[PDB]
Ligand binder design. Sequence first.
Ligand SMILES: CCCCCCCCCCCCCCCCCCCC(=O)O[C@H](COC(=O)CCCCCCCCCCCCCC)COP(=O)(O)OCCN
Ligand SMILES: CCNc1cc2oc3c/c(=[NH+]\CC)c(C)cc-3c(-c3ccccc3C(=O)OCC)c2cc1C
Lengths: 50, 1016, 100, 201
Amino acid sequence: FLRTPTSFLPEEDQGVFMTTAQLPSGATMVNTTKVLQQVTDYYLTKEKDN
Amino acid sequence: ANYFIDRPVFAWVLAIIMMLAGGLAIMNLPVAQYPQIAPPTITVSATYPGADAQTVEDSVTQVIEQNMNGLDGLMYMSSTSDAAGNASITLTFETGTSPDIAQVQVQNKLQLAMPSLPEAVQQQGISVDKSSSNILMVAAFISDNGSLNQYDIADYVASNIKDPLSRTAGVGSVQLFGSEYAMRIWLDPQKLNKYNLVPSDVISQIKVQNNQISGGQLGGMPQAADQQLNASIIVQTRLQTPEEFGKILLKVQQDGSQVLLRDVARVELGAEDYSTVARYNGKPAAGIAIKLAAGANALDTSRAVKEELNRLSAYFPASLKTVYPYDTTPFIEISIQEVFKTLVEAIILVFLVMYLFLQNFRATIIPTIAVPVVILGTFAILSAVGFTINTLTMFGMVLAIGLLVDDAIVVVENVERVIAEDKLPPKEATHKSMGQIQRALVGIAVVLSAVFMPMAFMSGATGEIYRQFSITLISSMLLSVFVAMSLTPALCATILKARFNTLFEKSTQHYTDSTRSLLRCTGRYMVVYLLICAGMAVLFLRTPTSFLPEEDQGVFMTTAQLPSGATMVNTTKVLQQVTDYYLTKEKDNVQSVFTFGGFGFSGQGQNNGLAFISLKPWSERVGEENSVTAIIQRAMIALSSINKAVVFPFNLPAVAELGTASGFDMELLDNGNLGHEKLTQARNELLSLAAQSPNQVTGVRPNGLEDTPMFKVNVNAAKAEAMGVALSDINQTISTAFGSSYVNDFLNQGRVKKVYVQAGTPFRMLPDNINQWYVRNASGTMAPLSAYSSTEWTYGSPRLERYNGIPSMEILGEAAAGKSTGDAMKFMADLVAKLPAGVGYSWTGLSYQEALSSNQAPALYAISLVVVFLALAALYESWSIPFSVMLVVPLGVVGALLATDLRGLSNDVYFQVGLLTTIGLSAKNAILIVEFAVEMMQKEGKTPIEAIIEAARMRLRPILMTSLAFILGVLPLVISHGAGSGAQNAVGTGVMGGMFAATVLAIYFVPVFFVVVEHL
Amino acid sequence: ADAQTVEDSVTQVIEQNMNGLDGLMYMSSTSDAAGNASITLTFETGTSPDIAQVQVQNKLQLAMPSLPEAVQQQGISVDKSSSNILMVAAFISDNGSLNQ
Amino acid sequence: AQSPNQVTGVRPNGLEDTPMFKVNVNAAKAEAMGVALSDINQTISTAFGSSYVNDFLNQGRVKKVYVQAGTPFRMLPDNINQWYVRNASGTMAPLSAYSSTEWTYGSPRLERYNGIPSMEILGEAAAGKSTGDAMKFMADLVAKLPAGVGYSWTGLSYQEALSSNQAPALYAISLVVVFLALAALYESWSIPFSVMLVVPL
Ligand SMILES: CCCCCCCCCCCCCCCCCCCC(=O)O[C@H](COC(=O)CCCCCCCCCCCCCC)COP(=O)(O)OCCN
Ligand SMILES: CCNc1cc2oc3c/c(=[NH+]\CC)c(C)cc-3c(-c3ccccc3C(=O)OCC)c2cc1C
């Protein structure tokens, strides 16, 4: 009992997850839009089966 | 029931469950000095800087009052307008109204009516607050020698202490006594005239230059393509230091020189409100009152608050010391200590009584462990029901202790007697004894529940106190009955085994032979009963009625009132005299004096002053010559040589809700359409019409201020407009010069403070100063204000009052030596009817309750008597037998009344609850005797006389044991003369004088009453 | 307004007044460079959200006068709803006639 | 970051410091030449920020009206040189005359927790380790930080800590309750003692 690890509630597969893109300070929306487009392209191309 | 005898382990498990539940409840149960007794009230406060009383009443108070409708449960509302620019509306709601709901309703109404108020009032902000006055501590902060003035300490507290507090567990609110910092700009009329300037120009330049400008963003959206830069733009920020305010540019002259604010004014970090001088033992000070939370532990909260203040004391700048006037934690500790000591003493006395009468250690063992189980279970029941721990609940527990002692004693005594005779083993003897007294126990439980019920179902402030008492008593009695039917029989079946003696035997023989051969002439004793009942009338006619005895709280209050129009110099001198007296001729008793000059109880003004005097702990002041009452009695004589003042000391009420139970409060409404002068003429007809008959009313005085001279400036609009000077400019100049002008906010060390503009002191002191101010024409030429204005002296009220939207006067007075409150109220009514037609009266504060819940206690007690008779009839299976039991209660009440009159006490809530406890216990004894007689009549075929004689002879011993234990258990309450001795004396007197007479009369009167009722 | 300007004028001013609440567990607070103040008070489990909102809006009026006139005009939203998105519904154009 | 076997993906939930543009307006020179400081501030605020003016009707709905400079005129620090302020006599003067510009630094987001400055840090536990081990490791790491900084658990971590703290008291209370129930049900103190010896099994 002393050596077993503790937790609160197990993780689940809820069918949805999130991605955060944080650009260097002072960046404009052009670069943020390009980065988010890269994220969208990766998710829709390399993971189109899921 | 009876089957718990065969299962001792079940009874032990139930007892352990009760003990665990009681411990868990004690671990987490709110504690406080008193519960919520006062009805919920909501206070609405508005500030109009520089406004008069009439101006405030016209602009703010009436507008707020006209929108205070549609509030659920509102009882009444009273409004006050001061000459300092303060409007205060207090709305008192019905008991049981949720304070948060009422506060949000009042806030919504006021906040809808907000646009109708003047912009000066709106800028300050109108504050709506819940008022409970449940102060836990009042911590004051003082400067050692001279390092910090009052405003420095007040600002440091408000900015570095109030926020660390109010987040401590248990703290619900913190209120500050003092004013924080502000940027004071003192104008100079000569310098303003030199540069052709007016206060309006200064205010406008401060608004423009002490401003926050939102620059925007370089880049920002929408943005061009290939945009790679995005930053915030900073244009201007609010000023922070007095030097920055002094460098504000007002104008640039044709020469080219710059005119700055410092060139026309003095900029200084001053105070927002200068109208209060707070001193602690002659040193500048600032205080905070912590008002606790709901469901919080007063002891733990106090410990945490002291720990946090000690931790913050390392961050104090220099010579800043914390002192703690008015700490209520010691009283709550004392109450619990007294309860625990009483329980232990009762247990020891029970042990002595049983091993003086029964002479068996195993017999004495049972109650010693039975009583604490019921005590802990009562704590658990109190927690489950949703009650807290205060003085009233603990007092109810103290009485409950004797209530449980009775049940334990009778159960063990009956088991022991059935063991002693009939040669029965303990188990079957316990079975027989429990079979003899089960129905009696149930009937006693029902009778006591019906007796204690009426106190629960009361209305007003008294209802809550009586509810605490009755709930504690009922829970304790029901749990004691359950324990006596479940755990005590099992202990008797298990633990028990198969000079004074001769004296007690002879006493029993004498008593039983007298009772048997005392039926020769009973009617004489019957008329003796009549005489006794006559006593319970005559005594009841001579009881001085009170509500709650005043206790040695260790603090009291002295009010100093200068005559009229007196500046704060005279008030400060008078309060210095008061504190010097209290610290130089009462240094052995008096520890500290906290003086507030400029603030009183009849309104804020420069001729009012208050003083809070704190006393040394009871362990250091011993004797009657060092008591609170004697101290204030000597202070009354000493603080009367102070001329040009009405210095008057008195004591804090036991509960801040109410005091002066003989006194009364009334609002003399003007009604009709008569003005203030006619109303004050009617009030002057009063205070003389009532003074003409001292035999009923004594201290009829008004709770308000009287008319004072005022300065009137009449501005000639025609001349000003013809010369080219706008009337608005003149009005703004006068208002800003003599009253303050709040401009905007600035940042002091990251905190938002106000900025004020006003004239310097030597320019706003005398009427001639009005001649020093200039106003500018449309062409730019300055001309004196004396050219268009004339000055005059008028008279006007410095404080105006309204009641339910109608002007009032608030006449408060007192009753005679003995005349009752109802007669005083019914005299003041129809004394008002002699006033000029138009006026009327209303009762507020306490009298309102006494005019709304009057014919309730007799109805409740009649219902209780009917229920008790019905329960007795159901138990005895007869309609005449219960009379012999119901005709014994007056014997219980008479002795307590006699003892209370002999000691010289009053009729307090403690006396009433002790009277009820004694009545219930005597009724229990009579019930047991009559039940035994009824059993020996139903079986064994015996006449009523012999049955009642044998029942009395059998039950003499348990009655003696219970009476001795109860009388000796409350004896230390009589002899206690230290801290908190008022309630202790009341309960000791009532119980000791009631129980002895009750048992003495009952043991002899039950047989004759039974025989007489059976005959008829 | 900038982040510091908001944090001083609005955020701290509002935050000083949220003390006397019944079952408060903890309070977070945020000031943004877009001109946003986002005070967030988490109360104990079992507390009535209606009573908590009533108390919060009661104590917000004690700091409302100290707020600027550009923040008092926009209004102060006191929401008792959850802080986590339950469902997101998006709307698009089939051929592309409508812009964003 | 140098302990990937215990915590992975530790990141701050905030924004880093950014450069800021500061415009210093010469009130003395502005008043000497005639223009008002209030007009200068209003012009800058409207041009580079915005100015909500009024409400209007669009397709039967009330919407807002905004006034702002065009996109080309609020992009670069040099754009301030293109704006003019009217003198009290009607003559327009450039805004760059009575003004200077500089670059400073500032935080774009300020966070406070329980009334004091704070920074929110999110993280995850490494493979094999659980959330409790990650929380313990992060507490140990915070214990090695410069004096004056502390840490708190909020959100899911608060509930996790509360549960892990309060479990054993619940175990003991349940054991006592079941012992007492057995003793009451079977009138003997030997059956509960013989039965409670099997709980460890
Ligand atoms: C076998 C053993 C028994 C012997 C035989 C049976 C004899 C039983 C006789 C019946 C006695 C019943 C007495 C309890 C109910 C009446 C007392 C409270 C009534 C009352 O005034 O109502 C409210 C107060 O009650 C409250 O504050 C709510 C709770 C108060 C209930 C009193 C506590 C009972 C404790 C007994 C349980 C344990 C006994 C068995 C183990 C007031 O109205 P409000 O609430 O609006 O006032 C405003 C505050 N909110
Ligand atoms: C150190 C002595 N102990 C006390 C000192 C006090 O000083 C006070 C000074 C004040 N002005 C300073 C600018 C104001 C406005 C209220 C004060 C109260 C007070 C607060 C709430 C409700 C009623 C009162 C109250 O005055 O009644 C007396 C119990 C007060 C109360 C106590 C116990």
